[PDB]
């Protein structure tokens, strides 16, 4: 059954499908279900928080169509915001190191957004600085994906309840999610804990930057994860345990899932599926394990993931 026609492309954000894994996980392990957040029209889970953060500022009188938003971003949040801003009548300015690919640049520019490149030597510290400067000197609205409560709230209102109804009458024994901003794990974890009081909530972070585990920040290749700090949008009390995933482990899992399940997802999804399988082997046959696939592998054809 197809959705009845809509007036705006943002009206089809959410309601993402779930697929059971058949080949990458043993028959004597728990069932593993993955939620394909790349089925959102913009291609990633960030579709949800991009729309949520704009709608929140709209209901509060902070912004109105025709206004300009600015955000320091080098990932799917910029894509989601450029997507949502084009659909709802906003100007978008994004700051990022000059090291970003030309493909990523063209994607953001195709939606009509303006790009402000910062010194690559300054990484995201330079992009954050320039974003604040543009905010102050020119009056742009800064959604702040690491502090905006609409980020974990939209998962509490949509992503979570979707999973509740998708697993109606079935007990979810563990939910696992990679932590970038932390909004997915916090919003979904809160909703799932209320329904399944025995559920285990697991945070996934890069082994090369195990900040939630207590280690020091470090360079890693798990795009979308490992921000290097504790985001304000992360409920640090929501997860019962942490599972660390290495760089090559996530890549090899994504390649396996693509070739053996037909599910082509990003590197963070490989880290999520690997962690879900490890938890599925601990839980055993009969139990149920759920994780989230944030983005599609086609977005990563120019990374070592699929080259």
């Amino acid at each position: 059954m197809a959705q009845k026609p809509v007036d705006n492309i943002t009206q089809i954000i959410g309601g993402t499908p779930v697929v059971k894994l058949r080949n990458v996980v043993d028959d004597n392990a728990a069932d593993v279900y993955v939620k394909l957040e790349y089925q959102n029209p913009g291609g990633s889970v960030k579709d949800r928080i991009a729309l949520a953060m704009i709608e929140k500022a709209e209901r509060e009188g902070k912004i109105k169509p025709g206004d300009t938003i600015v955000e320091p971003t080098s990932g799917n949040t910029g894509i989601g915001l450029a997507f949502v801003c084009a659909a709802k009548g906003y100007k978008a300015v994004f700051t990022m190191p000059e090291t970003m690919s030309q493909e990523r640049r063209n994607l953001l520019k195709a939606y009509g957004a303006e790009l402000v490149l910062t010194p690559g030597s300054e990484a995201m510290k330079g992009a954050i600085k320039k974003a604040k400067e543009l905010k102050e000197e020119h009056g742009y609205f800064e959604p702040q994906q690491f502090e905006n409560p609409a980020n974990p709230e939209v998962h509490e209102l949509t992503t979570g309840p979707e999973l509740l109804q998708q697993f109606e009458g079935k007990t979810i024994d563990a939910f696992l999610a990679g932590v970038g901003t932390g909004g997915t794990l916090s919003g979904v974890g809160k909703v799932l804990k209320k329904e399944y009081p025995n559920i285990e909530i697991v945070a996934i972070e890069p082994e090369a930057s195990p900040v939630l585990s207590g280690g020091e920040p470090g360079p890693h290749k798990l795009q979308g994860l490992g921000a290097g700090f504790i985001p304000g949008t992360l409920n640090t009390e929501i997860y019962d345990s942490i599972i660390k995933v290495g760089n090559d482990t996530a890549m090899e899992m994504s390649r396996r899932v693509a070739k053996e399940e037909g599910i082509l997802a990003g590197i963070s999804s490989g880290a999520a599926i690997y962690a879900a399988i490890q938890k599925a082997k601990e839980l055993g046959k009969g139990k149920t394990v759920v994780t989230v696939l944030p983005s599609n592998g086609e977005r990563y054809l120019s990374t070592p993931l699929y080259s």
């Binding site: 080098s74 990484a123 921000a227 290097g228």
Partner: peptide, 5 residues
């Protein structure tokens, strides 16, 4: 250190 978020 760099992220991509």
């Amino acid at each position: 250190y760099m992220a991509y978020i």
